[PDB]
Amino acid sequence: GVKNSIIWFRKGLRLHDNPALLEACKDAKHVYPVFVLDPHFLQQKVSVNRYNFLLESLEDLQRSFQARGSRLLVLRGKPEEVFPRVFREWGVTQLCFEHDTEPYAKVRDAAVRRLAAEAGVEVVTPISHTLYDTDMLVARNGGAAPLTMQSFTKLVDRVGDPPAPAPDPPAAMPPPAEDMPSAAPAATGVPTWQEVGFKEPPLTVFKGGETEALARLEAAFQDPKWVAGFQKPDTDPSAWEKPATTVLSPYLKFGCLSARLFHARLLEVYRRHPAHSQPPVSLRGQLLWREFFYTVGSTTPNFHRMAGNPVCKQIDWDDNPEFLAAWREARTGFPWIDAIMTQLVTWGWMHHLARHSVACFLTRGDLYVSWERGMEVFEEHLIDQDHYLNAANWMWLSASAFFSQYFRVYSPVVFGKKYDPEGRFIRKFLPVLKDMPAKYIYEPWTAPLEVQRKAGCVVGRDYPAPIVDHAVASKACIARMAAAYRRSK
């Protein structure tokens, strides 16, 4: 008989470097590009920024398939229920999709494989979300994931280069068959943020999709010397007009950009610049942080929680809803913190060291609230929200796993001031402070009342007083952390 295939998108929201897609197309009479959208997903905490970035990414996919004589089908429902019916309707002989190592993904994918088997459908699941087959890495390491980035980097180097990106798909693709009721255009289109039921528009400045991802890739590679010399810890968290890092994270999260393409492009530059930066600080090192946390996270039970998580220190975090709320709502009274939390909710992206500042403040630095609570807030609002990376970094920042130097505490006043003494970042995200003299903008409570009134920003009415004294709070937290480390024996 003829081959009729499904290419199922979940991540990997791209045509480039898509071995799943290339297989689906091979010798196929009809190809059905599918994304399965849960129409009740938002009736359960998800930002319109995040969801709309997905929608824009699916719109871009739709355009790309339409340009090649095909069409993206956005099926409504649950995969386990939808696939059995479309398998029979479409006479499907092959289902292809990119492997996903998240916990829910593994449960869902096992069930779809069983269903496919019952229908006589071959399943093909190439690895292309991560640089490497992460189970292969664990296996080559003797059965456990490396637990430091140094040892992880050594492991990947023994394995060698990640696979090259797969070729671009053909200029024409086999379409869905005609008169297939589950492929009706009216039931299978990409909805708008209004239609999924949001009442407030997205404010983020970064647009979804593969086209934008590739454009932003080319922008970053415009200066190869910048790419070659890139050192992460030396980049500026206060830069917002021209962010100091690539802002490729949302594109990498959704697979609008291939990590292997990015990595291959880095090696090309590196060959022409043999003095380039090395891991962990290099741009390649950044993709390795991602790979490291995917590898550990995918092989650790309860990785996104404290209890029952074998890598995580059990810490006596306070049940402090008022402190969490003040942090989440950008009303701590420390303009650096509040400006970053404002960027979180308005853009859904902040620089890495901005995330460091706010996460340290929430957890082991000032407020002693669980990292699980911070992760949850980040999960709601980040356009790059990534299960493994979010958990791992919150555990790092809280000195719960990977990192143990709890005497290193960032200052919510001093940290940003060393980059941006003018307070340009604060003024942008906290316009109530836009006329405050630079001298006081990180510590507005120290402005004379005449200065506050003249600025139109009186502390305690226009902008909150600080919710803690940093010196007192950090001292208290450091003592609690020391005690928590002693109890774990």
Ligand X SMILES: Cc1cc2nc3c(=O)[nH]c(=O)nc-3n(C[C@H](O)[C@H](O)[C@H](O)COP(=O)(O)OP(=O)(O)OC[C@H]3O[C@@H](n4cnc5c(N)ncnc54)[C@H](O)[C@@H]3O)c2cc1C
Task: Specify binding-site residues.
Answer: 232, 245-249, 286-293, 349, 352, 355, 384-386, 390, 393
Is residue 119 within 8 Å of residue 33, measured between CB atoms? no
Q: At closest approach, how far in Å is the CB of 338 from ligand X?
A: 17
Residue ranges of the annotated binding site for FAD are 232, 245-249, 286-293, 349, 352, 355, 384-386, 390, 393
Q: And the tokens for 432?
A: 């109530």
- 47 near ligand X, judged by CB under 6 A: no
**Per-residue mark of binding to ligand X, 306-345 (x: CB under 6 A):** ----------------------------------------
Q: How many residues bind ligand X (CB under 6 A)?
A: 28
- Contacts of residue 174, defined as CB under 8 A and 6 or more positions apart, other chains included, come to 25, 28, 29, 30, 31, 70
* Contact of 285 with 278, CB cutoff 8 Å: yes
Question: 83 or 349: whose CB is closer to ligand X?
Answer: 349
Interaction between residue 420 and ligand X (CB under 6 A): no
Contact criterion met (CB below 8 Å) for 451 and 437? yes
In the three-class reduction of DSSP (H, G, I as helix; E, B as strand; rest coil), residue 28 is classed as strand
Residues 248 and 213: their CA atoms lie apart, in Å, by: 7
Identify which of residues 97 and 402 has a Cβ nearer to ligand X in the complex.
402
The Cα-based distances of 399 to 211, 392, 395, 408 in angstroms read: 38, 11, 6, 10
What's the closest the beta carbon of residue 367 comes to ligand X, in angstroms? Answer: 14
The CB-nearest residue to ligand X is 245
Q: How far is the CB of 482 from ligand X (least distance, A)?
A: 22
Q: Measured from the CB of residue 395, what is the shortest distance to ligand X in angstroms?
A: 9
Q: Is 304 in the site for ligand X (CB under 6 A)?
A: no
Helix (H, G, I), strand (E, B) or coil at 161: coil
Q: Per rule CB under 6 A, is residue 17 in the interface with ligand X?
A: no
Indicate whether 240 belongs to the interface with ligand X (CB under 6 A).
no
Contact flag: residue 97 with ligand X (CB under 6 A): no
Let me know: does 2 contact 90? Beta carbons within 8 Å.
no
Choose one: 66-74, 84-92, 101-109, 349-357; the region binding ligand X (CB under 6 A): 349-357
Closest by CA position to 352, among listed 331, 382, 324: 382
Cβ 379 to ligand X, closest distance in Å? 7
Q: Is 206 helix (H, G, I), strand (E, B) or coil?
A: coil
Would you count residue 369 as binding ligand X (CB under 6 A)?
A: no
Distance of closest approach, residue 392 Cβ to ligand X, in angstroms: 7
Binding mask 266-295 for ligand X (x = CB under 6 A): --------------------xx-xx--x--
State which of residues 266, 312, 382, 430 lies at the interface with ligand X (CB under 6 A).
Answer: 382
248 near ligand X, rule: CB under 6 A: yes
Euclidean distance between CA atoms 11 and 35, whole angstroms = 10
Q: Are 249 and 350 in contact (CB under 8 A)?
A: no
* Residue 232 in contact with ligand X, rule: CB under 6 A: yes
- Alpha carbons 382 and 423: distance in angstroms, whole number: 24
Q: Is the CB of 128 or the CB of 249 nearer to ligand X?
A: 249
**Residues 373-402 as b or e (16 or more Cβ within 10 Å = b):** bbbbbbbbbbbbbbbbbbbbbbbbbbbbbb
Q: Find the shortest distance in angstroms from Cβ 309 to ligand X.
A: 16
Collapse the DSSP code of 286 into the 3-class scheme (helix H, G, I; strand E, B; otherwise coil) and give the result: helix
Chain residues that interact with ligand X, rule: CB under 6 A: 232, 245-249, 252-253, 286-287, 289-290, 293, 351-352, 355-356, 359, 378, 382, 384-386, 389-390, 393-394, 397
